Amino acid sequence: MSKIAALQFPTLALSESRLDYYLKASKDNGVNLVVLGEYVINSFFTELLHMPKNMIKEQSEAKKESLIKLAKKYELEIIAPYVSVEAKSYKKLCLKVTPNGVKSYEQQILMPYEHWNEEKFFSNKTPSELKIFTFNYEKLKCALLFGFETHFDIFWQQIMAKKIDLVIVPSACTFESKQRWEELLKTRAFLNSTSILRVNRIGKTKDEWNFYGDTLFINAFGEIESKLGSEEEMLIIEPKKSDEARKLWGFDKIIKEF
Amino acid sequence: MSKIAALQFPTLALSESRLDYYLKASKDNGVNLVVLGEYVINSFFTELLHMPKNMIKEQSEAKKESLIKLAKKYELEIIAPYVSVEAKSYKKLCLKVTPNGVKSYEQQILMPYEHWNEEKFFSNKTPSELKIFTFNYEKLKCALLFGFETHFDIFWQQIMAKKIDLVIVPSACTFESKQRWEELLKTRAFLNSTSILRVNRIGKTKDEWNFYGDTLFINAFGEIESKLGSEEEMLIIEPKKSDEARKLWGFDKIIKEF
């Protein structure tokens, strides 16, 4: 039935040949939805601070055109974080590329820390009230969240209210926080009875920040179903409906009795 | 400084010296706040189902009188889950017994599961709006939560809103859920920058439900600072203010604009 492919990549080269191979391989395994991690289409954040505006635009626009073309050619959907280069500003988006159009999700909560200040570098619209990005994938109710945004309960309360089966989490996570991330996502999946697909990038930066993969899939019971290592590889998942797991603990039912 | 003693007990006997001994040992170690787990003053839930009403009342009322006397004698405070028997109705309370009076916390969300139906057995007031029980312990802002109530994000949002330093969680946890409980509490402490004191009971029931202790203290970084094993023992903790840990990630700073 419904299958999803998670591609664990470093920053892709300007050519599209590596992406095309994995997209055909995803479609050959009966996958109709593909997800990439953060800073795979684009160079990692710390290089973006020093790169020329026009090359960042070229890097982004080359892959967006490729995804649009490849989504048509292989008739599948692609979810990929994407740096939108505007006239006088940069926006951190996540694109959902289908054969019949492109949808975009503008990240609502960005890291403001000095050493990794995405809030300063990007010019994302500050929403008045947070709103989860959701979409239907065949028979699954899905939500899309950036890695940093999973830290905030408000999103999960909206996810539980909408009976989401699967939360797709493109991310860029350092190895040092490996265990904290597993415990967080396992807890989120259990408390909200939703499956979670966390897709990480791989690679080492000039500052020796180590992204060691660990793309993983968690079921609505909070159990890890499958996970990747630290190499460039593809994870294929068959996400199931959240209903049975929702009834076991009935957290939503309990909160709905108020 | 400010110290708290967690007493990991089985169901206490009607005429026990354990309470007088451990309260004095706490006060001799400079501890002014003592916490017991769930179903320590009273027999465990599944045994209460088969006990006569008057026996439950006597079991409860004997320990309340003792705690009142011991709180005055040793000049400290005691937090203890407590079955209040009115007429032929039962209320699952947590008492805070001090030298100058008793305050009570009525559990707001109770387990409704068939095999462990506290919602059916007890007659707790169905709350209008969920509201955390809070109190100051010397210079620390403390909150009180029953084990089951930690599963619901709404409580944790209020805990963060009040910038709570320590959440005290009397609980009754089966050994089978050891890892899930640890990951949950570490995540809540980290996400909300609060320390957590989880006090469990010990003992085996007739149906072979294993309460194997593992009373633990977690700091506001989400790290386990200390923990007990499966024996009857006392855990003394010196909880610190959450301020420094709260500034590290600044979850409150980010989230308060929504």
Side-chain angles (χ1 to χ4, degrees), chain A residues 20-57:
Chain A
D20 180 71
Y21 166 81
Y22 280 98
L23 290 181
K24 170 175 171 261
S26 301
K27 190 65 180 184
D28 284 349
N29 286 274
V31 162
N32 291 332
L33 178 55
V34 175
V35 186
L36 318 181
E38 286 185 50
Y39 301 110
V40 166
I41 280 176
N42 292 106
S43 300
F44 180 63
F45 179 78
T46 54
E47 305 186 15
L48 291 183
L49 294 185
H50 299 105
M51 264 153 71
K53 199 213 221 312
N54 280 351
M55 301 319 288
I56 301 161
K57 181 186 222 295

Side-chain angles (χ1 to χ4, degrees), chain A residues 109 113 127 130 148 151-153 157 179-180 183-184 186-188 190-191 248-249 254-255 258, chain B residues 109 112-113 127 148 151-153 157 179-180 183-184 186-188 190-191 248-249 251 254-255 258:
Chain A
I109 303 189
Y113 312 108
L130 298 178
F148 186 58
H151 294 101
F152 305 92
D153 285 4
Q157 302 174 302
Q179 195 184 333
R180 195 186 72 243
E183 298 177 351
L184 162 67
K186 285 173 74 197
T187 299
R188 294 302 205 189
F190 160 70
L191 289 182
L248 180 62
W249 289 85
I254 290 166
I255 291 152
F258 292 111
Chain B
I109 303 190
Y113 311 107
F148 188 60
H151 291 99
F152 304 94
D153 282 3
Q157 302 173 301
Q179 195 182 331
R180 194 186 72 243
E183 298 177 350
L184 161 67
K186 284 171 74 196
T187 299
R188 293 301 204 189
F190 160 71
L191 288 181
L248 180 63
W249 290 85
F251 292 145
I254 292 166
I255 214 40
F258 298 109

Side-chain angles (χ1 to χ4, degrees), chain A residues 64 66-74 76-79:
Chain A
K64 188 243 276 308
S66 291
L67 287 179
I68 283 160
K69 157 182 69 175
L70 293 182
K72 285 153 159 183
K73 176 182 190 192
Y74 298 118
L76 42 68
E77 304 177 79
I78 301 105
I79 291 187

Side-chain angles (χ1 to χ4, degrees), chain B residues 45 100 144-145 219:
Chain B
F45 179 78
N100 317 121
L144 179 63
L145 265 190
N219 66 26

Side-chain angles (χ1 to χ4, degrees), chain A residues 173-174 177-203 205 207-209 211 213-225:
Chain A
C173 302
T174 281
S177 67
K178 221 195 126 109
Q179 195 184 333
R180 195 186 72 243
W181 270 101
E182 253 167 56
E183 298 177 351
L184 162 67
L185 298 187
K186 285 173 74 197
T187 299
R188 294 302 205 189
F190 160 70
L191 289 182
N192 299 280
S193 307
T194 191
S195 286
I196 303 181
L197 172 58
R198 187 266 219 118
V199 187
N200 199 19
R201 68 189 312 275
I202 48 160
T205 70
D207 289 321
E208 299 289 343
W209 298 5
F211 297 91
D214 234 69
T215 287
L216 46 77
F217 179 53
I218 304 173
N219 65 25
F221 293 103
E223 322 170 310
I224 287 161
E225 294 263 20

Side-chain angles (χ1 to χ4, degrees), chain A residues 7 9-13 15-23 232:
Chain A
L7 300 186
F9 280 152
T11 291
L12 298 173
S15 23
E16 67 175 45
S17 158
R18 197 237 303 280
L19 198 56
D20 180 71
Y21 166 81
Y22 280 98
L23 290 181
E232 160 185 315

Side-chain angles (χ1 to χ4, degrees), chain B residues 2-14 16-52 54-64 66-74 76-175 177 179-205 207-211 213-232 234-239 241-246 248-256 258:
Chain B
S2 302
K3 291 164 119 179
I4 301 178
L7 300 185
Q8 183 164 278
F9 282 154
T11 290
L12 300 173
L14 224 177
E16 253 198 23
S17 47
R18 271 198 251 276
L19 208 55
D20 183 70
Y21 169 81
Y22 280 94
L23 292 181
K24 184 175 171 264
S26 302
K27 193 67 180 184
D28 287 351
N29 285 273
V31 165
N32 290 330
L33 180 56
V34 175
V35 186
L36 319 183
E38 287 186 49
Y39 301 108
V40 166
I41 280 176
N42 293 106
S43 300
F44 181 64
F45 179 78
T46 53
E47 309 182 59
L48 293 183
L49 296 188
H50 296 131
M51 266 152 73
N54 279 352
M55 182 180 288
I56 300 162
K57 180 185 251 284
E58 287 177 294
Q59 181 179 65
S60 286
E61 283 178 350
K63 286 294 173 299
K64 186 168 107 101
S66 291
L67 286 177
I68 282 159
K69 168 181 62 179
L70 294 182
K72 285 154 158 184
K73 175 183 189 193
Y74 297 117
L76 42 68
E77 304 177 299
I78 300 106
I79 290 187
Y82 175 85
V83 168
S84 190
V85 187
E86 315 126 353
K88 226 289 177 180
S89 64
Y90 307 97
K91 272 186 187 273
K92 189 165 181 230
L93 307 180
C94 188
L95 302 188
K96 185 164 134 286
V97 183
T98 78
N100 317 121
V102 180
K103 279 174 72 73
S104 116
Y105 168 56
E106 188 172 341
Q107 187 168 341
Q108 306 172 79
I109 303 190
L110 290 150
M111 285 184 120
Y113 311 107
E114 231 73 39
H115 65 283
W116 188 347
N117 205 336
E118 295 189 346
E119 196 37 44
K120 181 176 156 147
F121 177 80
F122 296 106
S123 297
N124 279 40
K125 182 191 303 294
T126 303
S128 42
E129 9 196 322
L130 297 179
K131 167 169 179 59
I132 55 172
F133 184 99
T134 70
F135 64 97
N136 295 318
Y137 176 59
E138 310 193 344
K139 297 308 171 68
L140 297 165
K141 295 163 260 151
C142 298
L144 179 63
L145 265 190
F146 273 100
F148 188 60
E149 311 192 301
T150 66
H151 291 99
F152 304 94
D153 282 3
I154 169 167
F155 291 113
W156 292 98
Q157 302 173 301
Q158 301 186 15
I159 283 159
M160 173 188 292
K162 296 190 156 229
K163 313 276 196 58
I164 296 300
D165 302 300
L166 171 70
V167 184
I168 298 177
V169 181
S171 69
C173 301
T174 282
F175 169 78
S177 68
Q179 195 182 331
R180 194 186 72 243
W181 270 99
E182 253 165 55
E183 298 177 350
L184 161 67
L185 297 188
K186 284 171 74 196
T187 299
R188 293 301 204 189
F190 160 71
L191 288 181
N192 298 278
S193 306
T194 189
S195 284
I196 303 182
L197 171 58
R198 191 274 226 110
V199 185
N200 202 21
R201 68 190 312 275
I202 50 162
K204 194 77 143 184
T205 68
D207 212 82
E208 296 294 300
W209 297 7
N210 181 2
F211 298 94
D214 264 1
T215 288
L216 45 74
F217 178 51
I218 305 172
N219 66 26
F221 295 101
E223 322 170 310
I224 288 161
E225 293 260 19
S226 64
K227 81 159 62 176
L228 295 184
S230 59
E231 261 31 62
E232 160 185 316
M234 159 184 68
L235 181 62
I236 303 183
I237 60 168
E238 210 178 335
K241 284 254 135 186
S242 275
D243 302 75
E244 166 202 326
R246 194 165 265 118
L248 180 63
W249 290 85
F251 292 145
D252 64 309
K253 320 186 190 193
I254 292 166
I255 214 40
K256 81 181 188 304
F258 298 109

